[model samples]
Target chain A: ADYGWRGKVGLISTPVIENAHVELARVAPEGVGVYQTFPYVPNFRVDATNIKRAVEQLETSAAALGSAGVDIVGQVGTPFSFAGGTGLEWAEDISTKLEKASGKPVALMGLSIVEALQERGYKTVAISSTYYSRELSERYTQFLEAGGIRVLTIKNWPASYAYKSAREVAAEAPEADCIIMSGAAVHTMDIIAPLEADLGKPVISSDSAFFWKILSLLGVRETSGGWGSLLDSL
Target chain B: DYGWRGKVGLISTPVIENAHVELARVAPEGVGVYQTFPYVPNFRVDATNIKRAVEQLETSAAALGSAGVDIVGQVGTPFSFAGGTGLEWAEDISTKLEKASGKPVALMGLSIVEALQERGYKTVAISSTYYSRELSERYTQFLEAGGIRVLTIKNWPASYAYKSAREVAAEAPEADCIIMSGAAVHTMDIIAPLEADLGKPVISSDSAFFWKILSLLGVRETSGGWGSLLDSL
Candidate 1:
């Protein structure tokens, strides 16, 4: 394959079972219909305490994604599953286990946040989402900062309506080099473009970044739309 | 007995996981907490399929209400879960089933309206714990069908209302009827505060009818507003 990116991605998250649908549509513009795996619930925060089982579940979901013809599988959801308590400890452990089981590269959503910072050479980013309180949103930013990404601003929804939160990003947020939407609970991909158009820069999210990273790994270079900047980027 | 007039009842379309916390608040005030379990994945909404599903709901719920005889079976719904059927459709199943089983049954939302109607409750306020907005609208429509007028509707996402119920109870509307919704993730402990706060008649789907059933059989008054089961005489 002469493409710049190839491989598949799998998503696992707590408090939510799926957010990869948005990631898939925006990140892969090559017409690769099935690029991600089906999702499994981590039983929210309770089941997250058992990280070993969580990793195992990720492996199974990844394998299923691989079998479904996805070239590579990347894991989605950061603060809740990857950064809840452990740092890269959970991500490293889960990725290693998934690689060992599926024999494919696994990228964590948080890892992409770090890598996105490393790629753009920008440490500061703006945040967006609909969270109940500022505390959880700040904690999420701290998780990214721990990964070498600095969160300059965070705009969150007063309540937990993901659809509404997704819609509010462009209208409510200010300018930034790249907008970071955390929380698998909020479906953020649909708003990436309008935000990118406004800020005149790339918009990154746990979902969008992971999708881009997976595509880059798969060695595919093409562009598409229906989402936002990530879709337009390879 | 706490000398209450009506029995309390509840029908969980899904399996009852935490029965104790759900029934305690509504029992012992001369309340009866009757529960029914329906099949899992209540999302199938083909009319025929839902008809079967509703029959299953009606049968199991009516069976639980049979011992108390006078208990009102209250079923919960989420218009989001079922793709094909509307909220009115779900309530209609409860009504027809009660008639077929020779029992008086209603949706938790519907019974709230009936109780308010009996109490001369025309103007009402509404709130929910963790419920779909679509489901909430259907419930409002159901109440309108019963001749009850709605004043306001405030709610948090799923399971959130459980933690904030007590705090929000203080914000009860001054309408003649006050309603706490019967969303699954919510425990029934939210009712008393609203009832106490508004000083107007407050009825939640699970507590009110379950309390009614207890009064039918001379059971001891329920001490708290939690759990979904009460001791019947």
Candidate 2:
């Protein structure tokens, strides 16, 4: 039995399994597999109540997925880590707890964004996505800054429909060296190369960054290129 | 910017995105792919819709062939087996389209056949998700037409697609392989895991289709972790 021969990723999405399955598969290199689960986080509401409930589900979700036989566990939803108005350690604490619970490495998407940006020495960043609140974006800025990167701008949320949105964030963020599209729903692969050429900077997305972190923990090298600079650097 | 090694065109029945993503994920490094399809509502093997789907496949294959793809393959397995159109019907269509387009055209039904035969997997137990019993039977007959043995089939309507594979595999250890058929299940990540657990080869629609595509392109590189057959390539 060569279960997870390369590696298996257990994804605990905030609420939906579709995003966990398709979004991760789109970026995973050859051999990596996915097992998707959810914590029954309500799809609506960006408040503390909902965030608290979602956070409560984390350890159990990691344990369930981990015991079910994945090599590593990752949670989707960038805002889950920041929407509670928490700092970098808060998210890292959740990751540490999840890793302990799952007996495997954990990469929360929000913290992975910070690690991904810092890994490239990207000190300045701007963000845009299909996000609903300006306040949550501000908390994200706080989160990124807590992880040591300076937040330059956070614009509103593509064709391709992500193509048009990635460009708008690049244009809106002049001083930033990197652009982060912080939503898994925003498809980022097809537009990455073209966008990077135009912006002359790296473009990061929730899905690609999470995959980068998962593959990094899996100790995988030699992935197919054109995902983004983050995973390609691996 | 597009397919670097060679281009592939995929005509995904019932829609785009699924086959495109599934097949593209397994494409040998630098081999790019594209997908397109016409509208299809539901498939209780609806006779008229199935007929319309075949017509659309011809149109889609020609369009992609004209667009410069090195090969084109149909995504939906049921599309070929629909209305009991059977394996030879699919082969006839592939022959015509390949001649007209002058590029290799493959269908999921035939790809599964080729893959099972080539892998020397003689007997199979089916994990049929979201498929009606009749459609599952037709799929069974389709495999039998390829000279493969059909041991048993279990359907859970995608109730637990991953679990269903384990259920059928655990029950039918006598079968040489596990055959899981569903475009909607997103089974790529599970293929290797299932094989690892079952200690037998697992053949899903995308695995067979992508293997056929890679086989057509003379690509010997493995898509790695997909399963033993894909890794064996």
Candidate 3:
């Protein structure tokens, strides 16, 4: 069919770590192609040192996608998203380097969360994490705080059991203007709509933020498919 | 400042008039449309006029840039990509336009590719109203290079400039999806009904091109009486 999609989106993701980005791409709005490749890493760990090394590996893989003719590039995986917590300047530095290597526009999963929050006029937001580590949860809150958004509360759950963790967070979230789900590996899109409806606030997930950034780069503003306000209303 | 939400600059050939109609239908309130056409003779998109066409595109894009348009849309799909050089030449031209205008420029071929790729269409049957058999085959190769497999392609037998909606719809094959190629043909009125009859998604050149332009500008006003892609947007 002549739906008019000629450009490809290249994703830099961790090998064997997560498939949430792939899931988001499956339901992406019409008229754009999504492609993915994993960075070659010696080990898979959610720490600062390992993540920095993994990020360094992305430049070459992104260039490979550029050589194959993708129009844009984005990084996926929870650890890569957390790397942006070092600060916006650092996330931007990585994005710029990826652009230089790939010769195409690039968006990072972590930076996209801040952008989505700003676009939706969100200020104080509650945090929900699929990972149940106090230090990791604190880091996620700090990342949002660095972007000028205040943290109202943090709800931590053990990583795994996608919908159950998100549902519990939504059911118990405190009074905040918005709710943000931290961790790209967590499946959050399924409950975004109902949770937003129940809490009467916009809900943003890691995959949702990445998906929103991809659509913005492609120049699409409104979409359907019940993925919550980020795709439907934002 | 006028505070216009967005302003789209469209570069069209002299042979078309429906672009304004289609764009106006879906653009949100406060969004503006600016249009300009290159000074090429009507129906002169053969190999001899390709260079002149590119030059005209540059001039129009520069003019739009000076007008402070936020985005640029090119409607000359066949003239730009139907030449022997294939997709790279079109990309080079769009990149130059974006540089000159200092704004995003969405090309016709790229939009078509994005639309098809988004829908997960792997195999496509094409129908065109312009280009000779040789040029049509080259266009098929261009689509293939962009990662879509062409099951079959057929064009209007005699070069009458454009085909009727019914005539264009009848030429489509039973592939995964159908493409009514050739930007000049009046195929919009038939896309929805034809898709319903054929039990598959059908995209015409002009509609797909316009859909991509709106997508680039971030406008999402849904308009009816068009194809599914435009209405869905």
Candidate 4:
């Protein structure tokens, strides 16, 4: 397999980046391989300072992937959403830098969320964070607000507590136009349908969002894997 | 299933109406597209007219947004020439348009860069219909700055006629790819044959930009019979 299957999708991520490959490989429309690389994130915390490091790491990975002959690279993580805030500009800024570095197409999770939200007509959102304190949750709130989105509620699970299950989170997801499961380390696919069913609105998780973006960027228009309505609808 | 098939709003200069129209005709079924032209001072294809064209882009974007257009595009390579700075300025213009329209805005330079990247081509032979040596050089400079090497660049005066472009291109030294610059040049019909003859990819401003638009819309099916790029998709 020269470049794996049909094509190559180069993924740049943090320490927990392995899950992206797992999701993408399971539903990559067959013949496509998800090649992944990680930028050094010594501190696993999701914050603006670390996100900047993540972006630089992705840039380096993008260049390496370009040299390796991958058609496209995706900078996947929560820091992208946390670092850039609301509008597609921040993500596009990262995409442009990666493209310039490797002469290849680049996709970002943050921008993908913006496009997905706009496409779905979601204006108000309720964020469920797996990490971060109340102050950190407020900061994440400000990030989404910057993109012109209104945050109705912020549900931050304290570091001391084990992350709540999707069912538990969905049970507490406040009423909003849409619901988002923040943080890459958390598992939310199991809750997407349940939460959406519970709230009667679209629910997005970071892992699912990253998968949706990479699939779309790779030109797999009909990507569906039972993860959520987001993939099914797309 | 969240990938909605919405309309693509096109903001074009007065001169490239035919290019945009031809693009619409070739678009895949179920993909809606509509276009509006901005006032650009007699449709002059020069740097002096870009600022006004961008303003017109904003107006068209607003109109299209009101009409439920999903994505927007400013259709031409000239916007890349805005401020006489080339591709960098084109990116800035894209950002400004996205902010102004409050939606994703596709630009011609981005289209070309993406196409070049998709094929992993590093060197290119360029053929432009624009007669100005300065403009041709600027186009070459734009590509070079994007990390693409310009093996050869040729500019044909309008008096030279359209059929001569293929000949002008065929004579350039062998390179990784071939490109026909300018949306008004009418090179789409010649792409596949030229690519076959040259044994490499042949791209034009209109076709490359069209492919980019469809990609943005998330339509990946091969819209073959138009040219190699779309056919390969």
Candidate 5:
């Protein structure tokens, strides 16, 4: 086996996927390499109806990834999943279509939260929507609840995030079985383990869950060590 | 306690934190860190622009030099090769900066060539991730100017580097090493895997810069798993 012996991941991210590398450096296993492609053409409003425009960009990149022999393709961006209020079914369908076209497993950041939740058997979830707007946050809770998971509460966290604030939010949501941290742009990898330990409950974040779904799809053993139970259990 | 190994200042052009993170990834713990002051914000990678930004290097040296940093690194390959400067020219730049800043100042392209020649690699294949064809060629021109035969040169997004390195090596088997030359193309993670598979050196711009900075700081024993360049250090 060569470099990328475990698997090569094709990443579809915001215009620049540089942030993914930092996390990959932290948790990615040996021989696992990633290539990134961009599908988003910036300079547009976040109107829900416009989400369809990004469909082709991802399809084109996914096709490239497939031809390049990547084992898995991942699309990042939580809001884009429900951006058009297209619902989780539409989001899952788009990924399915991409998987079919590329002949590789596809993981969407939006649906991966549910995938991780379902896999972990976390029936009840509460949202700490870091930097997510009120409408987008509500739709995320809606999307989660629509996936047969129960939603206990949703709170839009402040713009600035710290470990103290994160643990406080998760500890406050006593009814929820897991705390869902939204915002892939937010750096959540450093907080997961300590936060989970502080609350004695699971924590799923866009950053950790995206990689969790991708690594699982790649069939890589021992997903990550320091992230939390969700990824460590993989 | 902080200066047990002293601080190494990293000056970046993109006004981003990636360089500092790269420094932290391989730099052993307790080696104090400082990354700021020499940012080429919103600057284009052209002769005229990069030429004008050259003084930013000197200014950054003086800033980091006086601030108790044992070594300072400016992480842009083009900055070193701008105006087709030779290693002699880059070395002179370092000597001048070191005299004024009163500490070792490293030039990115300078350290890279140092890394290559130290290993005695005769010929090299160059891959400048995401660099324009012309910008990528500058690396070829710079390396050739340094007397290293560039068997081939290719440019693509940073994402394709792992695959691209293999492709370029396959195309040019006579090449002794593969050089990844881009400021944005961080290669700390993939270098070991690439080397294990390629069975040759895969030196990146940032790695060479950090390797040289470590040499000047008089510190040895980097955190392993980065690649051969730092592995041997």
Candidate 6:
């Protein structure tokens, strides 16, 4: 059971993503660690020019993390990060820029999720969490469909706070074959198992999936159920 | 009772005189307790400004202490608050002020020490637990060589130092005590038991001395603790 890459993960997210850390702390194993970057406040709309701003922001965060000696840096944000501009394009541009700036590989969650869904042929997925306001959730639904993925059963928190969101998900809990919980506001690690058991699905959230992708890229996958399933993979 | 001062007192400099509550808290019962302004930095009472600061303090304290003032106590501090001033100058100026105002007064340290000596004090101990500096030892030595004995002393740690003025003096020892060493920071009613414990004379530095001076003005009771006598009038 020895994979060459076992036990390493780095997470860089926006200010609104602090709730993700709670999940990391709860689920991440002994050798795995999560580092969050300072949240960036954007100055413009999400267009070609503004997309460049996002690129610069993510690149800067990546370069700093690289300098700090991390093996891999993953951007653990979505939606607000996707921009109306092609989310995949934006993710790839920043990944290229960050790899160039830090001389290290950068993992963009958008691309990772897209690859995961494509690989599994998981066209229709469920969505749940606090950040999914009516407008935001609709936008995300649009983004997924735009990415060639379909929406099957959607479930999430109705509140604004992450702690409360996790609680809501745990209560009156919904069911899905493969639940995609929102980790941006709540700690993704805490709800994974309970959600998976309740729905008989593979539970995944923002931090969970992001860490899974980063560690997988870094050649280190020895992790457990607490942090995320990605760590559990290798 | 020992010397005199039915009036006001003002201290300047940084000698052994930073304790204001001591005198103000215990001015002769009904006597008025006024103070000349403390020395400010860059402002020393020299031949030029010296006469004026001194005259102003004396005139003010005298006028108020008059009719009801039997003494105009001049208080001085341990450090000459500002540069270019000496302790001797402070004592000297106050002595002159007494003559000008026609009021009998006593230096704070001198008055407290005299009271201690009058009580046949052999040991002069303290619990300035808040001040853990070696300089405190030097001050104690100064009081020791002045004929009083330096017995027990312990610094009160600052964090839990509230109401310490009474606590330390009460719990320190059950022997002949004279003065509550430098418990000036705490504002309490009295140095309750030290006076009763010593069986000789236990003056909470602020209480015993300040109380006597305030008594000169016929102050019987004050609203708060520490030095009710002085705060009352």
Q: Give me the candidate number with maximum TM-score.
A: 5
- Model 5 chain A: ten consecutive residues of lowest lDDT: A35-44
**Candidate 1 residue lDDT tens string, B1-233:** 21144443344444223232254344554442333334334354666686576665555454444424355444454422243333455456656667644565555444454456556778777766555686677767767767777767776533455344444445644576556775454435544454455455556665544444443445655665433222222
In order, how many clashes per candidate? 55, 4, 15, 10, 1, 61
Candidate 4 Cα lDDT to native: 0.65
- Expressed as tens digits, the lDDT of each residue in A112-195 for candidate 4 is 666666667789877777666786677667766766788876666432232243344445554567778777665556666766
How many angstroms is residue A147 displaced in model 2 relative to the true structure, after the best TM-score fit? 1.6
* Residues forming the 10-long window of minimal summed lDDT in candidate 6 chain B: B77-86
Any runs in candidate 2 off by more than 4 Å, and if so which?
Answer: A1-3, A41-52, A172-174, B1-233
Tell me the tens digit of each residue's lDDT in model 1 across A94-208: 6787677656777777677767666777666766655437877766666677777666666764223543443355345444456666765556666667656655766776777
C-alpha lDDT (0 to 100) for residue A36 of candidate 5:
47
What is the Cα-based lDDT of residue A213 in candidate 1? 73
Candidate 1, position A61, lDDT: 55
Q: Report the lDDT tens digits of candidate 6 across residue range B91-179.
A: 56556656655665555555555555555566754656535565456556556646766666666433344344345545655545634
Q: Any idea what lDDT model 5 has?
A: 0.73
What does candidate 3's lDDT look like per residue over B22-84, in tens digits? 565556566666555444545456677777767767766765666567898887665456555
TM, chain A, every candidate? 0.73, 0.87, 0.85, 0.79, 0.90, 0.73
lDDT per residue, candidate 5, B1-233, as tens digits?
44467577666553333566567768876675554333344566666676556665666566555445788776667766666455656667778678756787888888888888888887999776668887776767777777799888887644588888988888898888898777676678888899999998898888888888888887886877888888777
- Predicted model with the maximum DockQ: 5
Output the better candidate (1/3) by DockQ: 3
For model 4, the superposed segments whose C-alpha errors exceed 4 Å read A1-234, B1-4, B43-52, B84-86, B157-169
lDDT of 4 by residue, B2-95 (tens): 1145567677554424444456556776665544434334545446666665665665565445535577777777567656454778878887
Q: Candidate 5 residues A12-52, lDDT tens each?
A: 65643335644764587877866544443434454544555
TM-score of each: 0.42, 0.51, 0.48, 0.46, 0.54, 0.42
The runs of at least 3 residues in candidate 1 whose Cα sits more than 4 Å from the true structure, single-residue gaps closed, are A1-19, A35-49, A67-69, A84-86, A157-176, A226-233, B1-233
